[PDB]
Ligand binder design. Sequence first.
Ligand SMILES: [Mn+2]
Ligand SMILES: [Mn+2]
Lengths: 116, 115
Amino acid sequence: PDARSDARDLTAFQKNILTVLGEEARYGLAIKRELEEYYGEEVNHGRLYPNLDDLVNKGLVEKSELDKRTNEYALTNEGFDAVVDDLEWTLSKFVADADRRERVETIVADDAAALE
Amino acid sequence: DARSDARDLTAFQKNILTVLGEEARYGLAIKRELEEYYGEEVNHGRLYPNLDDLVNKGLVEKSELDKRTNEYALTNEGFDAVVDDLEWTLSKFVADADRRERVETIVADDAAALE
DNA sequence: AAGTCATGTAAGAGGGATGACACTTCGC
DNA sequence: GCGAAGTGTCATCCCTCTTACATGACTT
Ligand SMILES: [Mn+2]
Ligand SMILES: [Mn+2]
């Protein structure tokens, strides 16, 4: 399977969900909480749990159980490709100049400093 | 703030801005690259409503190439929206060494395609 | 058992898409 | 003129989010 076919028509909310899981697997309300900080507003859980179940059936996210009241959601290999594919597509269109490039390099470098 | 504008944007609109980040284009030119991204035919009745809706938000400047042609381009505010949801996904992707190595290889293979 | 936590779920509501129909303008 | 390019517009479908209500599970 190729992620492009199933990961280029997702809503911004669904793409932001996969971006979150790209950092590491989280449970339902942990994704809700880190999405809420991006938007600056509340994220109605009635919007989150259905969007994650759609992302699950498409093969982008997997659903495992921590308790049985809690589910830890994590990207499938296809889902990881979905994030990589869209990141390649943005950098393709952002790295249009030598100036644009190193703006990315320092963006990465700064994020490399943030780990320890 | 850039995140304020960036956060409230359809995916179809984030794609329009990423298109204009590469180069300022005219209406249907944007359409054709969005068709090459989606693998779909992009209804122009959907391209122009949003395009003008991004001009209402201040992220796109609608100039005029010819009396029948418009040239769309990103504003400074428009470009800062693209930068900061680039920064957002890169902060979440760069989670370890191999994710950093992977990114900089993309930018390397990307920067080599500019000749 | 009490108070949460975590998730499931549907009706109505809300907002963009579809698929046309229209105008002007350019090139031959 | 004639065809096409480029864009403007909307009725309606379409689909998602909102906004609640709902349950079982973990902690004490
Ligand atoms: Mn909630
Ligand atoms: Mn069209």
